[PDB]
Amino acid sequence: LSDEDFKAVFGMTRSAFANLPLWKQXHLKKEKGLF
Amino acid sequence: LSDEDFKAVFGMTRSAFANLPLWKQXHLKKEKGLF
Amino acid sequence: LSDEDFKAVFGMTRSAFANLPLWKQXHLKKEKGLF
Amino acid sequence: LSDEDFKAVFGMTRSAFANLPLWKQXHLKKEKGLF
């Protein structure tokens, strides 16, 4: 994803996302239809 | 937890829980604050 | 349900709902026909 | 890691992990700081 699209999809910075638990980073990608 | 307490806490049998993705079985355990 | 529609149906966010005891989260879903 | 801790963290069983290439099993450990 572009920076703009990552923001649009997840609503947080890449750094914040990378700090979430691994289960949640699973959940969010599934919730947003990315894999 | 005993099987009966597991049902009371998670709202499903262990066999059903086992058929959830491992990231979801992460989510639910964390939502209940348990193991 | 979307977070938007969840709040419209249950009168609270998923975060708040997740804090209710399971028997009550039973009650509410059964009362709305969404079990 | 115990098998239980492994599958909770990696989101897959040790058996599932073993299916992946050796360089990928490198990536998946190092991504979590677990090598």
Side-chain angles (χ1 to χ4, degrees), chain A, chain B, chain C, chain D residues 1-30 32-35:
Chain A
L1 298 173
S2 66
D3 289 352
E4 173 180 355
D5 289 346
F6 191 99
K7 164 74 166 53
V9 170
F10 296 117
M12 67 185 68
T13 63
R14 293 178 191 278
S15 286
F17 186 89
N19 280 289
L20 291 171
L22 302 148
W23 80 255
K24 179 62 176 177
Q25 294 188 44
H27 212 326
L28 282 176
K29 287 181 170 177
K30 277 290 166 191
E31 174 170 84
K32 305 296 175 179
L34 303 177
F35 97 93
Chain B
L1 299 172
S2 64
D3 284 348
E4 287 178 342
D5 280 351
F6 187 99
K7 180 66 181 296
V9 166
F10 290 101
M12 73 190 71
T13 61
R14 231 182 274 274
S15 52
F17 186 89
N19 280 281
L20 302 172
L22 277 167
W23 66 259
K24 173 63 177 179
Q25 293 180 37
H27 175 256
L28 284 179
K29 282 196 184 195
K30 295 276 183 286
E31 178 167 295
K32 303 305 179 174
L34 294 172
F35 48 18
Chain C
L1 295 172
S2 67
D3 290 323
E4 164 181 41
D5 288 340
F6 190 96
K7 191 171 193 311
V9 173
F10 292 108
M12 70 186 82
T13 59
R14 244 181 283 260
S15 178
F17 184 90
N19 296 344
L20 297 169
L22 185 50
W23 65 262
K24 175 56 176 180
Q25 294 185 36
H27 186 243
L28 285 181
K29 285 184 172 168
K30 298 277 184 170
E31 288 277 338
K32 305 301 183 193
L34 295 175
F35 185 62
Chain D
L1 293 175
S2 67
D3 288 350
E4 313 93 84
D5 279 353
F6 182 92
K7 77 177 182 179
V9 171
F10 283 77
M12 76 189 76
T13 57
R14 283 200 152 106
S15 176
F17 191 68
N19 292 326
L20 305 174
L22 312 97
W23 55 266
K24 186 64 180 178
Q25 294 182 32
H27 194 206
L28 293 177
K29 291 177 67 174
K30 292 277 183 173
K32 307 172 182 62
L34 286 179
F35 190 88

